[PDB]
Design a protein around this ligand. Structure first.
Ligand SMILES: *Cc1c(COP(=O)(O)O)cnc(C)c1O
Ligand SMILES: *Cc1c(COP(=O)(O)O)cnc(C)c1O
Lengths: 414, 410
């Protein structure tokens, strides 16, 4: 109890599993206080603590919503009891999500809300006398969580299905969806789906942006194709928006770029503004009713309360202009990366900026390089990318994009 | 803002549940519910499903949360570490069964069970034996509601016929009996022996099987499982998500047998019922053999309140406290032993169960206990409670009186 940074890393190295780690001692706004060679430094949280900290850390409105709920009621069991934070969050979600989503199931993590989505899809078709509809279809390059079911629909090469083969469910995979719209891709997706339709419960994809699978973007028109294909072959459409939710891609939900509603949808990550774990699975009235005819901390009051505040905070400001300024800033700051020798692509979509490199990025070099520039950056595979808090000033975005450019330079450099 | 009536309307229209009663407050061992539009204080007999061991809104746990909130809410656990995670991991490694010295944090009990299965499977692969992929358990168990966890839940309770081909097919031994019979253990070893080359691990709830029927078994069964797993080279996993942190009379139910599992899951009471957090612990052997995460992994807020809650338990003599709760439950439930619908009355530490000979109508049970100032949640033929450790003798009496009465209603 009460530990020194050196004591913390001594305990950590002996006893903690991680997903060499740097000790973090504070977080406020877009900034973390990290310990580097015995000294505290303030660095920009360029990753938003893995997509979560959309309003920054220790935002007064979320701090207060939390301590206000804490005064009244920490937690009650959602079996036989309901409460205001859950009712309030459900109403909000139902109002702001794509049209038709009328029903809300809370859970504790994004990976669990995906299992819940899949359970809804299976039970739906069983409710309709078609329990042969049990497999899932997706395209390559995706990520949906780390639980066994969620793994079955992650990219087979990235999620090491080979090291889990015959332990995972065999789902159907379409090729990687291209960035540019190609009607031939949609036609082939349709032709593959037609071959499995009677055994398929759902198509599940991340809309517009594929996150942990490789930070790829695809034309929102592909989602219009998916909606039509699914409606035509009687297969449910599930959108995983755990990473794309709450303004991140420039729309409130990435599905909004195509104007499509899925039958089932997952949200998480930025849901609580990065305070506490909370996820949600939504579905249509038809899905709920057909099924009709939980986790221990389901709908946690504390988590629902901070999330209520976070969503209202987003909604009560001109978030859309904010994201547009963030994207302009990322575009301007990353532009000089295009001409770097190791750089293969530079892409931006809302508050997401990616530098794709021609070789895997070395973390032992990249991490201290960015910290030297006052920026916490966490590359993966061949990608130097950022998803910064919406509160970042133009100067902060410039500081973030400079450190990314510099890491990318170093990637060619030696 | 919403009025209780507005909450009911929104809830009925938009919320999926495990008509619900509106809860508006929770403090100590009491909840404030709305009934007939009036707020009433009732005892949380269930501890909000095992979670609220020190009661709701405990000053020390509130302060712990608010203190961490003023310094940092959350940071990604990829590449960073922090003091809450370290303090918790050190506490957990110190207090759990000997040999468990590595901690993997997750956000729910189900996920921690999945992490345990993954550790077991990857362990044998690091041993050159990837054929060891299956899990073995006994009937009556509950391990969570994710697909992997469902595969080791009681096949009957989990409707495994209407999930056919979607769940992994695991090995099930017969229901472990309450009293100790060596033949049961000999028969478990024999079923296990047939599948040893196929089995990565045995996974059970030690001493008490919770959501699967509130059944108790002799700790000596765990001694035999430990022995059997060791001899056949199958890992032993204890799921202590419900049984942990003093609930059965020992700090961990494994302690009743004096055995250590190779992998252990904890959750529920970990944070004292404030926030969702779970942990999977494994031995050095398991960790080194494997090495040769969730978004909110090791959340500072949940880790900080857990440290407070765990220190709060250790810093009192929790062991005498649980003994008193058990005596009080036994005193208060005994009279039901001689009711016409009552099959069994059993107590294990701060857990009290009246089993009946028929399903319990909740439409009658729930309004009956509310009238007695108690929140009770019967399940199947079971009327049961696991009250906060802070309940006074008068509160236990009120709880057990309301339990005897719902049973009396047969
Ligand atoms: C509560 C329970 C679980 C599941 O935990 P969740 O947080 O609800 O996902 C797993 N195992 C046991 C023994 C449990 O009692
Ligand atoms: C992060 C992520 C998940 C998994 O969420 P966890 O809370 O880490 O379990 C699932 N789907 C997508 C798209 C994600 O980005």
């Amino acid at each position: 109890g009460g530990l020194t940074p050196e004591q913390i890393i001594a305990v950590d190295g002996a006893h903690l599993w991680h997903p060499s780690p740097v000790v973090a001692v504070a977080a406020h706004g877009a900034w973390l206080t990290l310990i580097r060679d015995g000294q505290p430094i303030e660095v920009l949280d360029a990753m938003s603590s893995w997509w979560t900290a959309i309003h920054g850390h220790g935002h007064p409105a979320l701090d207060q919503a939390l301590t206000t709920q804490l005064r009244v009621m920490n937690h009650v069991m959602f079996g036989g009891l309901t409460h205001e934070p859950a009712a309030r969050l459900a109403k909000l979600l139902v109002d702001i999500t794509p049209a038709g989503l009328d029903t809300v199931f809370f859970s504790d993590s994004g990976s669990v809300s995906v299992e819940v989505a899949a359970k809804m899809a299976l039970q739906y078709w069983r409710g309709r006398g078609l329990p042969g509809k049990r497999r899932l279809m997706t395209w390559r390059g995706g990520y949906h969580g780390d639980t066994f079911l969620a793994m079955s629909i992650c990219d087979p090469h990235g999620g090491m299905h080979s090291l889990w083969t015959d332990v995972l469910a065999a789902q159907v995979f379409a090729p990687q969806v291209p960035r540019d719209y190609d009607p031939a891709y949609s036609a082939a997706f349709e032709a593959q789906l037609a071959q499995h339709a009677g055994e398929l419960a759902a198509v599940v994809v991340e809309p517009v942006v594929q996150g942990a699978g490789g930070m790829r973007f695809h034309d929102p028109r592909y989602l219009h194709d998916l909606r039509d294909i699914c409606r035509r072959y009687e297969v449910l459409l599930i959108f995983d928006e755990i990473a794309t939710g709450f303004g991140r891609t420039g729309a409130l939900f990435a599905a909004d770029h195509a104007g499509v509603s899925p039958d089932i949808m997952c949200v998480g990550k930025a849901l609580t503004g990065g305070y506490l774990s909370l996820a949600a699975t939504l579905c249509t009235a038809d899905v709920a009713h057909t099924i009709s005819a939980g986790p221990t901390f389901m709908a946690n009051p504390l988590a629902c309360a901070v999330s209520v505040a976070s969503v209202e905070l987003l909604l009560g400001q001109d978030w859309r202009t904010r994201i547009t300024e963030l994207a302009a800033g990322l575009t301007a700051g990353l532009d000089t990366a295009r001409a770097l020798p190791a750089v293969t692509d530079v892409r931006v979509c809302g508050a997401i900026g990616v530098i794709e490199c021609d070789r895997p990025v070395d973390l032992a070099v990249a991490t201290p390089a960015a910290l030297d520039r006052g920026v916490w950056l966490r590359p993966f595979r061949n990608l130097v990318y950022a998803m910064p808090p919406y509160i970042c000033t133009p100067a902060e975005i410039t500081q973030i994009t400079s450190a990314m450019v510099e890491v990318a330079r170093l990637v060619g450099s030696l």
